[PDB]
Ligand binder design. Structure first.
Ligand SMILES: *P(=O)(O)OCC(C)(C)[C@@H](O)C(=O)NCCC(=O)NCCNC(=O)CNC(=O)[C@@H](NC=O)C(C)C
Length: 1762
């Protein structure tokens, strides 16, 4: 032992490490603050252990305790030294690990003691990586601390190079903690600084270079006149000489007021050559505007003519461009005075006076030097100067193409607006490339153009892509402040939101938040531009330039504040989402009107769309949808068209039809000339006509929050939920009318609702208030409160039903104001002051006046917040208040408020109420005191349980949940024997777009979003349950039966079992309506407690699963407060059920949370399932009229992973047929041993020559290719001589067992119709009814010619016909046999020194692998004596004597061969024992490797219709494979597992195995019907055939297939499939291995050296589920067991309970355990309820618990009053 000073600052004081040190009987002194060398915290201490310790230790301390200071750093030092190490281990892509090192004078550079390499998953979030890393360094310390303190570990120095980081180095990569590793590394590439050459040129320099390259090329074309490059250059130099002499210096602002002409191009280049920048002034601008631009530009010279000279009013030195005295005689290039950082132009932006944007030379050059190579601009191109020279569009028109040698065509403003004339000019002049603004483009795309090859657009949101031309379409984005454009996208596909593209050269785009921090990919934010497009700024306006042109506080880079919202897509392109301020609020919903335009244009008749937001003086804002179409479209039609996938507040109130959209002169839609409309409520508004219709409309207005409802307005499509329907019903009770929850979906408008209720009379008393209970000592609990109490008492140390939520606050929030407000809520709500105790056998509640809240204040870092939180999640004692612990973890950037409650208090609605009231109290707002208490509701409901309605509702579940309920066997792992509540979480986010389509679809078809998701979940579960027609799942309801309990803090949620049906042969919409028809009756009987529902159903209690259902589907509405939207639910590693799906509406989308049992599902299994749910969800929302059968579960990524891991087996194999190999080999090695029968040896030559003779004798009998001759012979050399001779002649051999009954051979005589029969002498008389019968033992049936007969067979000719219920003839071709032989030879090679054993009967295909397995490789075939296959002695004698290396065994016959060999030590040459014919016992693998080491046991599978084999799995000496897979396909084999509808099944889901490839059979002989049934073409093979095996099989994660039995011989007990092999193995593992086999009989029931009677059930109970226990195969001892029998019997209701009786079998539940424990406490016995689940028998549990509470009698006995 020794004293240890534990130094931690951002970790806790009670960590696993400290407690482990205390467990070793150490004294751990913990200091969370600074320590000075003279601090008493440094005396008598032997070690110093640091762990997330802020502050650096003093120098004297490091030297004084040298070798005794130990730090726990969560990194693989030397990598990521310092702060935030785990995050930097990912972002900098460094090695991952953890290090226990020594402390030196520097930051984590000391010598290492131990180090471990941890691995992060790409799909793990950063927070997941933090927990994994911090746990690894803690467990490593627990593992090595003793080896350190005892000096058993030698410190080693660090490998040289690594990384160091500090505290503020992550303040930009925040907001990224929930982002996965792959998505983080992607955002890195998409937003990290790339490595390029700078710009050392100006435009005139580059233009003067191109002028020398294409001097005589036409440069500008105005009217019919033209100008070449040299002529343009010389005319500009003349004017620039005159300008520079007048007094133009760099950074001057010479203005130009000319119309589009040649003189404009000359003028522009003259200013730049002189040295200045040109300020374009439109000659048509107002006079005051012209003067402002001149005054602001500070221009002394004006380049105008005589038409626009008087528009200056003596404002500058006018230089007429038509006066010859304005041009010099110098046509030589001027001397250069400019720099790449000089102004080139100043264009003004009238964003409403204008602002002069200043652009420099290097900005334009970077754009021009990118434009030319991007679009391939050649000197052969033609572009038009379309845009006015007062906009940056003309810069792209003029400057980008002049640097490429192209020709500019000046567009007269007389045209330009006539897009028909522009298409003419473009066609008759061959214009190839140009830039058209968005509005003009979308109108030009309706023109027949053949000249353009590239058309670029940009300015407004581009939507239309359908064009009448062969030109490529490009979309661009960019503000004038950043040159012209910064991103470019090629419009290839149709897009809803056409991307603005990827950044251009020397330009980087960043999507940031309001704090200028990096947003994750997909999350929107402000577009920030960085690169060589950023100009100097605004002219004479430095304040605004500092506002938009900012330097980054963390990157030091100059950025432009675009003010636009955008998001990065995964591909790399940027998607424009709108302006950050142009968001309008319609019906209280902030929307972007531009999101509606793509849906309206998708209408078949609308070709142009623009949605505008207009306002009325009253305040209300309305959307107007302007559309261009051939004629008008009905208003309702447009409301229907948008209603298919848009909510109501985004459906415009008014629609305006237009012939053509007005365009501004800039090329954009006018958006101000668009006609106006008019306070009307629309055309679909029908006002109430009766008193009841107005009464209902006001109730509808109150619930849905919409004023002036319509008679034909749909409740669900205007915001109605389930709670809104129940509100409507309750508000109608106050009126006096009764509406059922189902009648709303059948009457979803006020019109129909009136017709239903107008015949009803107002009844009083329909809504009774809740009576407030008078003051009492104790209060009775509710049924759900009792149930939560019963659950917690099973394991009184469980956190499964603990409710943890965290909220991240800014550091400005007073931590005490939170505590104060939380302490107010403890007073306001009696639930926070309620304590639950037990009075006898009754659970009661007691309210306490005041309770003390636990508010722990801590300090932590980002990589410790979770582990600081995880230790605060401790069990609750339901007898102690406040039942809610809280606290605040303060980091350097946030304050994490946390609280932990119990589900007996905090349900879903209680969390929303608590967040609402905390946000009010934190806002210093008043809180009107509460009015009702949970004690009142409990009494109300406990009384309602004795009503008549309750008896009606309990009959619904008794008449429904009784019978053989559905069985959902999800593809899980092996179910643990007990119950596991260990779990994890995976999340799937549905984007806001699909979320709208899901909601709009549900509303359109009288459904809620919950009903729609429930069907998708039901279909998802059904398809995983082998396409079941019925499923069972669970859900949760609010449980607020009395309407006065919606503001109370308590547990109300009730659990409902949902029995649903899915018809795969019908549409999604059909199943959607039938799901509603099964949910609504359940919601009408929803208030029966779940424990009573189970009892009424008379359900089992199988310990491997949960009652009634195993999967739960929950849905919570959107957050009502902002404090609620910023809350985070914590799982803490608990899964209450096998799988839970919760759909949470967050941020206009859907966050679907997958809570799963970690013992039943892996991370990869869940990742496949969340991807399959998305696959079905997208398939369904886009396939409503489609049948559910046509939806596929497997994803394209799973289809391609299954191919690569399984069906990628193609390998080119030689086409030399097996006969030609015997010829080729015999000629090479003629006297080498080929056959060995008994003690005689045949050589290749002897075999070949003997085979040749019988071949010639066969040819003269009419043996032609694809002719069949039957064989009746036993194991001999003649059989081998026969078989090979059949093939040499050209035919195929048909094996016929010679000892077959005459009826069988007659059948195969008829079906084959074959005439020839090669038989042995004892069987010639059996072939009596043939034609040509030859005795193989008579030299008459042989000939003299030892010559090899000619080759007459082709790779597609039949080689044998194996017969298999009347047998059928499987026809096998040559190349089929050649492929399985080459594959087996490539896998299990038989070489020259190796051999085979002929032991399988030739009426079995496995024999063929022995008949021919030796020919490739030139081995030998030892022919086992006939009937010796049953004698393992004779078998063994052969392998030892002949050196047999390849042997085939049926698993049943390998058992007697593994025996006998037990003990024998004779040497062996065996190499492969290939097993096939039946399922391999899991116990045989070790038995084989024990008796015969060095052998390689291999399990092979293959039907006769796939030659011989098809799949193989190599068993290893590890002996750990319980499934015993049949394996993966062989070379050029492909296997598929399909469902009942022909779809590929995913991993784990069972289906029918199917085969495909080269070694497939040609078909059944004389049975084309069966050939068409079992050999079918399939889209998986692209029209090629597949063989239906008829065997059930499942895919494994490895890829190896598992044999599940024949589909027509499948055993199912109560729906669940039975694996009878797993039953026998669990029965054989005992000592008495009688090896009894289990089989199923029908009465359907399972039946199967010890007097085991019913005790074997107890053995098969702790390993197998009750549905896989074979049905057919009182002695209380002490006073304790005698007592236990009485309490059990009295509670369970059973008489004479004996020990060794299963408590749960006797009807036990977690409720009856609490009763049994309660009765036992009053007699001072102590039983733990969890022990009942571990020791379900009395003799088992009586010692393992049932301790006594010691009673004493003393203290003060005698008193003496002095
Ligand atoms: P015993 O186990 O032998 O007897 C059987 C019974 C019926 C007693 C027992 O098995 C039982 O009660 N089963 C049902 C338990 C159940 O349904 N628990 C679910 C409770 N609801 C939730 O966990 C989720 N509800 C919420 O409101 C959460 N919202 C989101 O998570 C809150 C935590 C906010």
């Amino acid at each position: 032992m020794g004293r240890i000073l534990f130094l931690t600052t951002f970790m806790s004081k009670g960590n696993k490490v400290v407690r482990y040190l205390e467990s070793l009987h150490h004294e751990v002194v913990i200091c969370q603050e600074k320590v000075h060398a003279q601090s008493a915290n440094l005396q008598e201490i032997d070690w110093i252990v640091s762990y997330a310790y802020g502050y650096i230790l003093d120098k004297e301390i490091v030297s004084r305790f040298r070798g005794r200071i130990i730090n726990l750093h969560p990194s693989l030092l030397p990598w990521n030294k310092g702060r935030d190490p785990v995050f930097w281990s990912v972002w900098d892509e460094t090695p991952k690990g953890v290090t226990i090192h020594l402390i030196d004078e520097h930051v984590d550079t000391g010598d290492i003691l131990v180090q471990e390499e941890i691995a992060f998953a790409d799909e793990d979030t950063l927070l997941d990586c933090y927990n994994k890393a911090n746990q690894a360094i803690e467990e490593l310390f627990i593992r090595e601390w003793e080896n350190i303190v005892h000096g058993r570990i030698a410190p080693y120095r660090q490998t040289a190079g690594g990384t160091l980081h500090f505290k503020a180095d992550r303040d930009f990569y925040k907001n990224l903690n929930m982002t996965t590793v792959r998505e983080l590394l992607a955002l890195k590439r998409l937003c990290a600084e790339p490595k390029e050459k700078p710009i050392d040129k100006t435009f005139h320099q580059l233009f003067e270079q191109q002028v020398e390259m294409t001097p005589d090329h036409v440069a500008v074309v105005d009217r019919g006149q033209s100008l070449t490059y040299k002529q343009l250059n010389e005319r500009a130099n003349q004017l620039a000489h005159h300008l520079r002499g007048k007094g133009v210096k760099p950074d001057d602002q010479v203005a130009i007021m000319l119309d589009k002409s040649l003189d404009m191009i000359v003028s522009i280049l003259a200013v730049m050559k002189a040295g200045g920048a040109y300020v374009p002034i439109d000659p048509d601008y107002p006079g005051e505007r012209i003067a402002y631009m001149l005054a602001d530009s500070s221009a002394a010279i004006l380049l105008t003519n005589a038409l626009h000279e008087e528009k200056a009013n003596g404002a500058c030195d006018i230089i007429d461009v038509h006066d010859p005295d304005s041009y010099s005689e110098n046509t030589n290039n001027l001397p250069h005075v400019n720099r790449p950082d000089d102004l080139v132009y100043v264009m003004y932006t009238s964003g409403s006076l204008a602002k002069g944007v200043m652009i420099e030379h290097h900005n334009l050059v970077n754009f021009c030097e990118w434009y030319r190579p991007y679009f391939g601009v050649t000197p052969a191109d033609k572009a038009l100067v379309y845009s006015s020279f007062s906009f940056d569009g003309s810069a792209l028109d003029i400057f980008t193409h002049l640097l490429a040698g192209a020709a500019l065509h000046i567009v007269p403003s007389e045209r330009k607006y006539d897009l028909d004339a522009l298409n003419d000019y473009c066609n008759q002049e061959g214009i190839t490339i140009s830039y058209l603004p968005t509005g003009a483009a979308e109108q030009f795309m309706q023109m027949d153009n053949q000249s353009f090859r590239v058309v670029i657009t940009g300015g407004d949101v581009l939507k239309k892509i359908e064009r009448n031309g062969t030109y490529k379409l490009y979309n661009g984005y960019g503000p004038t402040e950043c040159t012209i454009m910064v991103t470019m996208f090629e419009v290839d596909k149709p897009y809803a939101n056409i991307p603005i593209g990827k950044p251009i050269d020397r330009t980087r785009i960043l999507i940031l938040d309001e704090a200028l921090a990096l947003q994750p990919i997909g999350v929107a934010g402000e577009l920030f531009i960085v690169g060589e497009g950023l100009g100097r700024g605004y002219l004479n306006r430095p304040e605004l330039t500092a506002e938009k042109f900012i330097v980054h506080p963390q990157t030091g880079e100059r950025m432009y504040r675009t003010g636009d919202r955008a998001r990065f897509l995964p591909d790399g392109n940027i998607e424009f989402l709108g302006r950050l301020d142009n968001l309008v609020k319609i019906r209280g919903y902030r929307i972007e009107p531009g999101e509606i335009e793509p849906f309206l244009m998708n209408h078949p008749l609308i070709e142009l769309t623009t949605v505008l937001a207009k306002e009325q003086a009253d305040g209300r804002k309305y959307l107007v949808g302007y559309y261009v179409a051939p004629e008008e479209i009905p208003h309702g039609e447009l409301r229907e068209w948008l209603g298919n996938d848009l909510p109501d507040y985004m459906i415009p109130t008014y629609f305006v039809h237009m012939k053509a959209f007005p365009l501004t002169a800039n090329g954009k839609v006018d958006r101000r000339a668009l006609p106006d409309v008019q306070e009307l409520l629309g055309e679909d508004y029908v006002a109430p006509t009766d008193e009841l219709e107005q009464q209902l409309a006001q109730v509808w207005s109150h619930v849905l929050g919409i004023p002036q409802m319509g008679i034909d307005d749909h409740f669900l499509e205007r915001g109605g939920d389930s709670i809104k329907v129940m509100q409507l019903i309750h508000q109608l009770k106050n009126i006096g009318l009764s509406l059922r929850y189902d009648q709303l979906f059948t009457h979803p408008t006020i019109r129909q609702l009136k017709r239903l209720l107008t015949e009803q009379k107002q009844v009083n008393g329909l809504l009774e208030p809740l009576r407030e209970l008078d003051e009492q000592a104790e209060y009775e609990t509710s049924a759900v409160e009792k149930r939560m109490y019963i659950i917690q008492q099973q394991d009184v140390e469980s956190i499964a039903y603990n409710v943890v939520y965290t909220i991240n606050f800014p550091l400005t929030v007073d931590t005490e104001q939170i505590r104060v407000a939380l302490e107010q809520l403890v007073l306001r709500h009696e639930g926070l002051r309620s304590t639950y105790h037990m009075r006898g056998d009754e659970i009661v509640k007691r309210i306490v006046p005041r309770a003390e809240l636990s508010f722990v204040r801590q300090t932590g870092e980002e990589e410790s917040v979770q582990s600081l939180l995880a230790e605060q999640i401790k069990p609750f004692d339901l007898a102690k208040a406040p039942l809610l612990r809280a606290g605040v973890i303060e980091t350097a950037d946030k304050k994490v408020l946390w609280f932990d409650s119990h589900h007996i208090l905090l349900d879903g609605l209680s969390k929303s109420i608590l967040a609402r009231e905390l946000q009010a109290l934190l806002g210093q707002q008043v809180l009107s005191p509460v009015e009702k208490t949970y004690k009142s509701f409990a009494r109300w409901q406990n009384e309602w349980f004795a009503s008549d309605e309750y008896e009606q509702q309990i009959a619904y579940w008794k008449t429904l949940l009784q019978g053989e309920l559905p069985a959902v066997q999800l593809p899980t792992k092996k179910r643990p024997p007990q119950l596991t509540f260990d779990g994890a979480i995976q999340m799937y986010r549905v984007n806001p777009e699909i979320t709208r389509k899901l909601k709009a679809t549900a509303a359109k078809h009288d459904l809620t979003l919950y009903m729609l998701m429930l069907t998708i979940v039901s279909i998802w579960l059904s398809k995983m349950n082998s396409d079941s027609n019925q499923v069972i799942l669970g859900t949760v309801t609010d449980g607020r039966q009395h309407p006065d309990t919606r503001e109370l803090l308590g547990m109300f949620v009730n659990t409902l079992p949902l029995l649903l049906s899915i018809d795969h042969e019908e549409s999604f919409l059909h199943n959607l309506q039938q799901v509603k028809a099964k949910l609504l009756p359940a919601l009408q009987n929803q208030y029966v407690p779940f424990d009573k529902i189970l009892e009424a159903a008379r359900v089992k209690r199988e310990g491997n699963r949960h009652p009634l259902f195993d999967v739960m589907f929950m849905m919570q509405g959107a957050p009502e407060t902002e404090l609620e939207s910023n809350m985070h639910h914590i799982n803490a590693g608990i899964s209450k059920f096998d799988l839970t799906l919760e759909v949470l509406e967050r941020e206009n989308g859907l966050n679907i949370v997958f809570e799963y049992n970690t013992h039943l599902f892996d991370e990869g299994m869940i990742l496949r399932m969340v991807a399959q749910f998305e696959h079905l969800l997208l398939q369904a929302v886009h396939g409503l009229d489609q049948q559910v059968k046509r939806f596929e579960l497997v994803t394209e990524d799973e289809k391609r992973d299954l191919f690569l891991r399984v069906n990628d087996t193609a390998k080119a194999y030689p086409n030399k047929l097996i006969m030609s190999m015997l010829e080729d080999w015999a000629a090479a090695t003629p006297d080498k041993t080929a056959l060995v029968f008994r003690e005689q040896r045949v050589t290749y030559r002897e075999l070949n020559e003997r085979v040749n003779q019988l071949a010639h004798t066969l040819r003269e009998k009419g043996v032609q290719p694809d002719d069949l001759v039957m064989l009746m012979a036993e194991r001999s050399v003649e059989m081998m001589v026969a078989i090979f001779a059949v093939l040499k002649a050209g035919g195929a051999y048909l094996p016929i067992d010679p000892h077959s009954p005459a009826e069988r051979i007659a059948y195969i005589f008829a079906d084959s119709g074959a005439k020839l029969v090669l038989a042995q002498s004892p069987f010639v008389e059996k072939a009596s009814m043939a034609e040509v019968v030859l005795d193989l033992n008579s030299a008459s049936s042989y000939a003299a010619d030892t010559s090899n007969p000619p080759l007459v067979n082709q790779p597609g000719d039949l080689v044998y016909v194996m017969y298999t219920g009347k047998p059928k003839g499987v026809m096998i071709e040559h190349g089929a046999l050649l492929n399985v032989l080459h594959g087996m030879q490539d896998e299990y090679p038989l070489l020259q020194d190796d051999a085979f054993l002929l032991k399988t009967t030739y009426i079995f295909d496995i024999s063929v692998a022995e008949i021919f397995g030796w020919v490739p490789g030139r081995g030998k075939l030892v022919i086992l004596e006939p009937e010796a296959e049953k004698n393992p002695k004779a078998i063994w004698q052969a392998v030892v004597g002949a050196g047999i290396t390849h042997i085939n065994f049926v698993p049943s016959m390998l058992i007697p061969f593994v025996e006998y060999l037990e003990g024998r030590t004779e040497a062996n040459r065996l190499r492969y024992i290939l097993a096939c014919g039946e399922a391999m016992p899991d116990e045989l693998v070790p038995k084989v490797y024990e008796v015969l080491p060095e052998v390689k046991l291999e399990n092979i599978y293959g039907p006769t219709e796939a030659t011989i084999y098809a799949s193989r799995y190599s068993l290893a000496k590890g002996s750990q494979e319980s499934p015993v897979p049949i394996g993966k396909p062989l070379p050029n084999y492909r296997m598929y597992i399909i469902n009942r509808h022909g779809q590929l099944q995913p991993i784990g889901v069972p289906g029918e195995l199917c085969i495909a490839g080269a070694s497939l059979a040609r078909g059944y002989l004389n049975n084309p019907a069966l050939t068409e049934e079992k050999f079918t073409p399939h889209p998986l093979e692209k029209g090629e055939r597949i063989y239906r095996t008829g065997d059930l099989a499942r895919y494994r994660e490895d890829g190896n297939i598992e044999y599940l039995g024949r589909m027509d011989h499948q055993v199912k007990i109560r729906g669940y499939r039975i694996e009878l092999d797993e039953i026998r193995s669990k029965l054989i593992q005992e000592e008495t291995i009688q090896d009894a086999v289990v089989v199923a009989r029908n009465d359907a029931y399972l039946c199967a050296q010890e007097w085991t009677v019913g005790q074997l059930r107890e053995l098969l109970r702790r390993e197998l589920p009750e549905y896989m226990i074979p049905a057919h195969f009182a002695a209380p001892r002490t006073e304790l067991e005698a007592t236990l029998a009485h309490i059990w019997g009295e509670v369970l209701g059973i008489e004479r309970i004996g020990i060794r009786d299963n408590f749960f079998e006797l009807g036990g539940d977690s409720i009856k355990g609490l009763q049994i424990a309660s009765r036992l406490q009053r007699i001072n016995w102590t039983m733990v309820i969890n022990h009942l689940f571990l020791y379900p028998t009395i003799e088992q549990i009586a010692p393992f618990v049932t301790s006594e509470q010691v009673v004493i009698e003393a203290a003060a006995e005698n008193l003496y009053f002095q």
